[PDB]
Design a protein around this nucleic acid. Structure first.
Ligand code: TTP
Ligand code: SF4
Ligand code: ZN
Lengths: 66, 249, 763, 251
DNA sequence: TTAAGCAATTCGTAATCATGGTCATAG
DNA sequence: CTATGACCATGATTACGAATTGC
């Protein structure tokens, strides 16, 4: 923790995985894996050792009335 | 077609003066089980729940489940054109949006009014039944004076239910004070306790809740952990009237 | 400070020549601009100071650079110990400093600004130019860019990310830094500033700091050296007021026979010109005596003074006024040959400025707190004004009459201190125009020169409500059929109200004056009130704005906007309204009826926290009384009952801590009876179910069509079709109108799942 | 440690109801003789002397010559929260600058315990003269209030003529002149005008309305006057002590 | 040391004044 | 157990300041 919260914030702004501020984080991870762009096997291995926490399993701007 | 007839119009006038300040619009759910109502206040803080059971109306007739939309100010103005001894009948169609009220004096004078209803798009809410753990049954006059007397000091009040009795405290810029009450027919204060309670509620809502004091002699206060305080009144072989208010955090 | 972005041009060339952007992390290249990157902020501030020394600009502009940008840079350079930053000026050994200043007048109000010292260079914040010249509703860059052209915590994670995010941030910053240049060259700011400095004789820094006194002092001194006079110093605290202008009593109502308007042009400067009034020719009460020559040596005014004829002296204020009048005449002669509309109004702005200068020459005399007051002159001016307008009204109503061979004796319906609205009688606009031109040219031959009356318009029909409140339709020629409406004073040009009310007043006067159909007007006002009560009106139409003036007058009595401003937020005690700006608010519903200052809230706070709206406040306090002003004079008091009955058929249709403890009782779609089970239809109203499904799928169909037109408009206003939209612009109707249709669709989609599915889905 | 009781305690409600419209503050002098209050008015025309002996109380403990100050109308607003049959108890610590009021019930089931904070006082204090009052009148308080209120709807200031046979309450007004005459009546409803030498004086009738605020405060009202001196109206607080309102006369 | 004028209409808040519903106690 | 006016409570009228626009 506090290092796992920057890896996800770095996965969320890389443009080669998609334009993602409307959906979940694991849905975008599996969308890129289907098309197989290059999802890395570390943004998966922190979404498995946690429960349904809203500060891991949510996009950066999931507040913010946009 | 709906038609009811009730001999004690005074009960109707007391219930309509319970609510004309807290609520401006309501929907009456007319059924074959009685006349039942739920509403929120205008401030979106408190809940009212009113039940007039079907038996206590001394001449009942309801064909089909209705829903009437009533502006409570115009109805409260109409029900003060009827003295305290009259006999009140309600007449409604199942195709119309206009209600008829006929007041029958117990002596040569009969009166009849027609009132236009309105269509409203409100949503109906309710309550689930759980066991509140502090159960107070107290005189209504003492509760009215206690709320009205603490009101001049400050605006919150803390209710403190302990073993032998309950204790109400309130503060403000001109100081603070409490009132005790202890276990010792209707002038008694019966106190059932399993877990002790201490909670805080604002006074403007309580001084709204104590407007319906002529409906009964005693009042029932129910408390539990972190739930909305319930204020309950009973109307004799007619039904009941409940207000609901949430605690401060 | 993480990014600085700069645009530079030579004046006269239609594009810039320099385009630079300096960032603080490594970035990605932008076509058309240079990009440099640094790993520390000291290098960034040093690089900007060296660039600003080497390019060596004449003028520095921007938007809110005085009160935000330059003192932020100066304080940030002081904190990080960089010694060589604050030397931005032209003199090689001088450092710059922050210094407070205030300005106040009854014309622009009071404003408090900081200044930063730059010797040699000139500053033009475009915000201060807008706030001084223009009277608008919001003064944000988005609002004035829409009005003239047509358009913090997210940025901190666009900068802590990657370098294409930083490239997006730099393109945004460069568009921001480019908009005030376009506004400066499009609005003809600098050309008018240079012409003002050449006509008045004051420097170019005084037209951004001072008022209208230094210019008239300057012109009077420049005219005083040519005859050898010296100015005295009189100072007095304080004299009394004098009597201002007359207004003629109306004949109120609705007119449908044409009224012609005749007025005097440049009234007070021509009074001061053609009766030889000046400081330097004011005759004291004794110095006429014991000489007895009254005839053609002096004159007498209605207030009582005596003033010397022009065969002895020429005054100084006639000559200054004559120069200003010729400059404005040349500006109008240039304006009479334009075809573009925005260019036509900016030349109108130039001539308006020269007429304001000529009238402030007269207003200099009566200012008892000033530098040289002579209230005798002011009283003589307004006495001559009153005498001449009552002369006009007597003459116009007296000559053209039934006994004098004409058709009908005319009757004046109105007059306000420079104009006369005479009602002639004919209903043909050609004959009214012909007689009105004859009347203007006839009456003008009873005066000295340059006193002239002129025809200006014909109103057909006309609507007179009170003093300083009327409306009409505008005729310039006859075969030029009609131009527009005129709304003098009414609820459509003031800024103290809601957009909903001003729009309703404009649409009612449109349907009532152009098409002459009161039934569509009643149906329109009914639909507005019905859609108000049914809770389908956007909150853009509900926002009220008020100006936060000096704090002691707002200490004297409790207001709504003062209460909202002085109540800080928990989020930000560092961004709040200051003195002089405008506070926006809406009124929410509560039970504290003694105080409308206890129900006011910020629009963004009621956005994010979802508080309800007081529809009865907006119904009886905002809407109702302007409508009763407008709709009554065409009919009787059965018209008040007609609109209060058109309310009455439509008032009976209203849409609706403890809120979490819901039960969510289902209800019959046909007859609204709460009941156990989830089926949509009631057992008595079950047969008519195909019609009840038919009804409401044409509502889902129309919500679907509104979702798509809005959420793809943001993609075209943003620029890109492949990346996310981030624009929470509070001055755009687009924002928060795109937020409620998601919830309407969320609700209307779930109401139709009460009905089963129209088929399987797992086959 | 001050701790005092009063069973028929409606009198405290009754005195502070007739105290708060006159003056905004009071200098409470607690001595071993009991509870006392000398205080001027706010308009520099009048004065209140309240004396409450210890023998008019029930149960008493005074260990200090306390000299405190009360803001009156907030104390009256607190005194409005207790009935008239209810027992009034006061408690005070000589270091803790507060007043602890204890309202007992006659049925003892409702207990009240209120607290008002203290504020400092440097109030002026002058002594009354003792002299001969040429007219002392014993009157019913209700009839006296009725008469002066009946005069309030004529004019503003009253002229009095005090003599042997009758007493003459005269006044002018915007509707003209009027006067009512009284005489002795040959225990509470009895009157007596004890007189040596007849006089005439001017007084303010509005201050008589202010003084008749203590109408239910005694058996009888006493009116004591002489030449060019403060009228003292007396309400004998039954078995307790007495309240005397001084009014400096007019010129 | 610094600042162009007057006329008029509209709306909100607190204070002033009118009037009825309870009530409290003397008959 | 029942008249009478004194007492509390709620609504109609006036006054004045603030804001903004027309000449
Ligand atoms: C607008 C305005 C008018 N006035 C006075 C002077 C003017 O002589 C008189 C008439 O007002 P305006 O008609 O507004 O101005 P104008 O008549 O001088 O010029 P034009 O007809 O070409 O528009 O009102 C002022 O003193 N100060 C002002 O700001
Ligand atoms: S909300 Fe959409 S349309 Fe409105 S300003 Fe923002 S991007 Fe443009
Ligand atoms: Zn049904």
């Amino acid at each position: 923790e506090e290092a796992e919260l920057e890896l996800l914030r770095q996965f969320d702004l890389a443009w080669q995985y998609g334009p993602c501020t409307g959906i979940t984080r694991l849905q975008r991870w599996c969308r890129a894996k289907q098309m197989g762009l290059e999802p890395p096997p570390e943004v998966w291995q922190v979404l498995k050792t946690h429960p349904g926490d809203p500060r891991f399993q949510c996009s950066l701007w999931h507040l913010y009335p946009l | 077609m709906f038609e009811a007839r009730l001999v004690q119009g005074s009960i109707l006038k007391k219930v309509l003066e319970a609510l004309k300040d807290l609520i401006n619009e309501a929907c009456w759910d007319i059924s074959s089980s009685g006349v039942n109502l739920q509403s929120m206040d205008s401030s979106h803080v408190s809940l009212v729940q009113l039940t007039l059971r079907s038996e206590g109306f001394d001449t009942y007739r309801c064909d089909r489940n209705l829903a009437m939309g009533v502006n409570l100010t115009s109805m409260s103005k109409i029900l003060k054109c009827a003295g305290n001894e009259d006999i009140i009948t309600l007449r409604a169609e199942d195709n119309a949006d206009t209600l008829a009220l006929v007041f029958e004096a117990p002596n040569e004078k009969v009166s009849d009014y027609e009132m236009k209803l309105m269509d409203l798009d409100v949503e109906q809410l309710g309550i689930p039944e759980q066991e509140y753990s502090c159960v107070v049954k107290m005189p209504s006059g003492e509760f009215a004076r206690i709320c009205r007397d603490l009101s001049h000091i400050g605006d919150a009040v803390v209710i403190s239910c302990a073993k032998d009795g309950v204790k109400f405290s309130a503060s403000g810029e001109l100081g603070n004070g409490n009132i005790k009450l202890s276990q010792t027919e209707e002038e008694a204060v019966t106190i059932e306790m399993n877990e002790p309670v201490q909670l805080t509620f604002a006074l403007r809502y309580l001084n709204f809740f104590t407007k319906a004091t002529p409906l009964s002699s005693t009042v029932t206060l129910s408390m539990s952990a972190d739930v909305p305080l319930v204020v309950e009144y009973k109307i004799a072989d007619m039904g009941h009237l409940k207000y609901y208010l949430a605690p401060k955090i | 400070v993480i990014q600085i972005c700069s645009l530079g041009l030579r004046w006269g060339e239609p594009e810039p020549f320099l385009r630079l952007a300096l960032t603080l992390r490594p970035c990605a290249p932008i076509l058309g601009a240079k990009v440099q990157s640094y790993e520390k902020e000291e290098d960034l501030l040093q690089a900007w100071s060296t660039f600003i020394r080497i390019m060596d600009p004449d003028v520095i502009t921007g938007y809110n650079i005085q009160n935000f940008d330059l003192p932020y840079l100066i304080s940030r350079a002081q904190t990080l110990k960089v010694q060589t930053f604050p030397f931005l000026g032209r003199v090689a050994g001088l450092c710059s400093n922050i210094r407070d200043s205030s300005f106040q007048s009854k014309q622009t109000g009071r404003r408090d600004t900081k200044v930063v010292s730059m010797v040699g260079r000139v500053q033009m914040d475009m915000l201060q130019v807008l706030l001084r010249e223009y009277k608008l509703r919001s003064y944000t860059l988005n609002a004035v860019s829409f009005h003239f052209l047509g358009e913090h915590s997210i940025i901190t994670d666009l900068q802590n990310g990657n370098d294409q995010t930083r490239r997006r941030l730099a393109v945004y910053c460069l568009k921001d830094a480019y908009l005030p240049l376009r506004l400066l060259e499009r609005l003809m700011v600098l050309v008018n500033a240079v012409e003002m400095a050449r006509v008045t004789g004051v420097p170019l820094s005084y037209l951004l700091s001072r008022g209208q006194q230094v210019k008239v002092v300057s012109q009077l001194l420049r005219q005083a050296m040519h005859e050898g006079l010296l100015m005295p110093v009189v100072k007095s605290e304080g004299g009394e007021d004098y009597t201002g202008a007359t207004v003629i009593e109306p004949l109120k109502g609705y007119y449908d026979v044409p009224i012609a308007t005749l007025d005097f042009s440049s009234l007070y400067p021509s009074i001061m010109m053609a009766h030889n009034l000046c400081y330097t020719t004011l005759l004291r009460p004794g110095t006429a005596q014991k000489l007895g020559l009254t005839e053609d040596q002096f004159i007498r005014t209605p207030t009582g003074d005596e003033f010397v004829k022009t065969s002895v002296r020429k005054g100084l204020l006639p000559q200054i006024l004559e120069n200003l009048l010729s400059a404005r005449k040349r500006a109008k002669a240039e304006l009479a040959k334009e075809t573009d509309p925005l260019r036509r109004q900016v030349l109108d702005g130039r001539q308006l400025a020269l007429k304001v200068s000529a009238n402030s020459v007269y207003g200099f005399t009566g200012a008892q707190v000033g530098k040289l007051p002579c209230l005798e002159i002011s009283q003589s001016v307004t006495g001559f004004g009153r005498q001449m307008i009552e002369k006009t009204k007597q003459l116009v109503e007296s000559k053209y009459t039934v006994e004098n061979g004409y058709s009908t004796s005319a009757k004046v319906v109105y007059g306000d201190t420079d104009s006369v609205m005479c009602r002639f009688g004919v209903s043909s606009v050609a004959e009214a125009m012909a007689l009105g031109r004859e009347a203007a040219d006839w009456v003008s031959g009873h005066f000295p020169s340059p006193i002239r009356l002129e025809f200006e318009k014909v109103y057909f029909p006309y609507l007179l409500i009170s003093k300083k409140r009327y409306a009409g339709l505008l005729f310039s020629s006859r075969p030029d059929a009609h131009d527009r409406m005129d709304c003098k004073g009414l609820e459509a040009v003031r800024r103290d109200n809601c957009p909903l009310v001003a729009n309703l007043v404009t649409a009612s006067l449109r349907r009532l004056l152009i098409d002459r159909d009161p039934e569509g007007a009643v149906a329109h006002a009914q639909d507005v009130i019905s859609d108000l009560l049914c809770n389908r009106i956007d909150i853009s139409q509900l926002v009220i704005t008020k100006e936060l003036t000096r704090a002691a007058s707002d200490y004297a009595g409790k207001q709504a906007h003062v209460e909202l401003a002085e109540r800080m937020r928990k989020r930000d005690p560092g961004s709040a309204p200051s003195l002089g700006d405008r506070v926006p608010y809406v009124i929410i519903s509560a039970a504290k009826g003694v105080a409308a200052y206890m129900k006011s809230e910020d629009p963004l706070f009621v956005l994010e926290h979802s508080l309800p709206i007081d529809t009865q406040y907006y119904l009886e306090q905002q809407l109702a009384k302007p409508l009763l002003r407008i709709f009554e004079p065409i009919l009787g008091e059965g018209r008040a009952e007609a609109v209060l009955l058109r309310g009455d058929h439509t008032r009976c249709k209203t849409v609706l801590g403890l809120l979490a403890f819901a039960k969510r009782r289902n209800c019959c779609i046909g007859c609204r009876t709460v009941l156990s089970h989830q089926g949509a239809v009631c057992e008595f109203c079950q047969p008519r179910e195909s019609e009840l499904y038919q009804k409401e799928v044409s509502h889902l169909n129309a919500l679907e069509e509104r979702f798509s037109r809005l959420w793809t408009q943001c993609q075209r206003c943003q620029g890109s079709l492949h990346e996310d939209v981030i624009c929470t612009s509070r001055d755009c109707p687009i924002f928060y109108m795109r937020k409620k249709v998601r919830k309407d669709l969320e609700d209307q989609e779930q109401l139709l799942r009460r009905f089963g599915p129209p088929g399987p889905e797992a086959w």
